[PDB]
């Protein structure tokens, strides 16, 4: 299979996920 298939899947999984988690964390820290 594509050697970049796994990398593309991983980055697709990760980047929006870390974005959303960062937004939620900097929301919840605030009152």
């Amino acid at each position: 299979v594509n050697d970049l298939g796994a990398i593309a899947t991983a980055l697709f999984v990760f980047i929006p996920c870390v974005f959303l988690i960062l937004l939620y964390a900097q929301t919840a820290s605030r009152g």
């Binding site: 299979v1 298939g5 796994a6 899947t9 991983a10 999984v13």
Partner: peptide
Amino acid sequence: MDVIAYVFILACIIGLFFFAVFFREKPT
């Protein structure tokens, strides 16, 4: 190794279900 990618995404989905069910902020 694709199997590992599929299984990891699936396990993350199940964990998300667990947290979304038992740890949602209380509606009010």
